[PDB]
Design a protein around this ligand. Sequence first.
Ligand SMILES: OC[C@H]1O[C@H](O[C@H]2[C@H](O)[C@@H](O)[C@@H](O)O[C@@H]2CO)[C@H](O)[C@@H](O)[C@@H]1O
Lengths: 509, 5
Amino acid sequence: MKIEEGKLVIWINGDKGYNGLAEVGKKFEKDTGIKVTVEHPDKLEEKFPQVAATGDGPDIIFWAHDRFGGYAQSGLLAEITPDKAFQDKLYPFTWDAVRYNGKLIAYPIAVEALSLIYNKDLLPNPPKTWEEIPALDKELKAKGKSALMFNLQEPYFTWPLIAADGGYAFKYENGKYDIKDVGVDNAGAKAGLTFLVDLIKNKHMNADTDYSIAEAAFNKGETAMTINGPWAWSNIDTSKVNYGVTVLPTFKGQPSKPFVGVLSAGINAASPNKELAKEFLENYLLTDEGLEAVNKDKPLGAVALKSYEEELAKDPRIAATMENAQKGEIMPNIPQMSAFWYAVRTAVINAASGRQTVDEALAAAQTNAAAEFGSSYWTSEYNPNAPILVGSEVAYKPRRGEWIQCEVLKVVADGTRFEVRDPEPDELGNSGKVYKCNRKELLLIPPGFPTKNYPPGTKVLARYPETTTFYPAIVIGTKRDGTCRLRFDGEKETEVTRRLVLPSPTALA
Amino acid sequence: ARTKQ
Ligand SMILES: OC[C@H]1O[C@H](O[C@H]2[C@H](O)[C@@H](O)[C@@H](O)O[C@@H]2CO)[C@H](O)[C@@H](O)[C@@H]1O
């Protein structure tokens, strides 16, 4: 039998009620004797596609419905098999969200949407427009408080604003979404981000604000507002803030259009426990007690289960959540969604940090929102390995331990194949020599700013000063400005900018 | 590619 056979392994994002779900798992373990293990790994959304297929990976995966279409398309999720008596217990529209090519590809759980969360003691009346925020912050600054603070590292949070005035993702054309019609480069979109960029220029927000930093700012009462979803209410209650939840601010007289997502559970197609996974989902989780339990840890939002939604239905927070949901649009689920998210995330972090003008970021964002991309076989907790698309820069390991820097000209066969070119003039071409490689012959050189440093002792491939070659090296320490101090093998110590210090594939063996 | 030494 396969190693995964005989038990269940669940994956869920770290901001949901995985402890409340562990409870649902205990009731199940008890009734069947089978073991259930709940995990909340980092960047699970990117690891699932690389480990699920090797025939391994978790048995159940929880994420917003937007990424499920790509998994189903690639054959990583199995077609679920609920009868009609069960299909009736869920809201017909939540089933619509997890359908791909007329096939049900996952069990829906809840409808979640971002709302404006505010402090009542600090702000008895919240602004209705974004344009009131710049003045609201000047007023609040005199008392040592800020007006707004939310995650600027994840595009999902800024999207509501980028969409209010006309920005969209993919156009819903005939009976479908035209991937040839991206709307992240139109004036509607540019006007929203430009407004966001200005808020930062005028010191109303700092581009370093991430998720953790904002949550604390609001829970300690350092800021009057924040834009988050239902799952965040658990921590606020635990704190002191006397808060409220209402509609998002308008922009240019238009409502903020938050992308609406349906948390959903998928069943891995490689799994030998598809039938134990169904038992768990239909009889234990999607039950009044099963949801009530997960809802208790961290609020789920508007639940797909009709009978239990009758409870939260009257809750004002759910009311606001559904209000904003009705004003926004439901995320698509085509395979191009992950490429799309990588492009916008790249454009938002860049425009906000000055590294790129709004025009430049969004223009490129439109160029890579539909692009086919691949990922490197070598992964690292310190450096991203995707997405590798045309125009990307990488470290290539010639068949002929030196790695040369190359540009990517073509991604083919679903990202399992590339055609890279060395830009330095070669005997066969002054434009550069071209090679064909698979996923193990290269490492992605992240184009954006670095996020994590390498612990001292880490083996890496750094580009040597005045060369286009990456040589083996050992990390001594990281200089504050970010820069890595390194001892190069077979030669003072050498200082190389972090952007040129990649993980070692050899060490990763 | 450009090399060392
Ligand atoms: O920001 C990109 C990200 O947006 C959405 O992810 C949300 C998720 O749906 C929420 O439930 C919550 O966990 O916050 C996430 C963003 O931090 C998309 O669902 C996701 O695929 C996309 O990468």
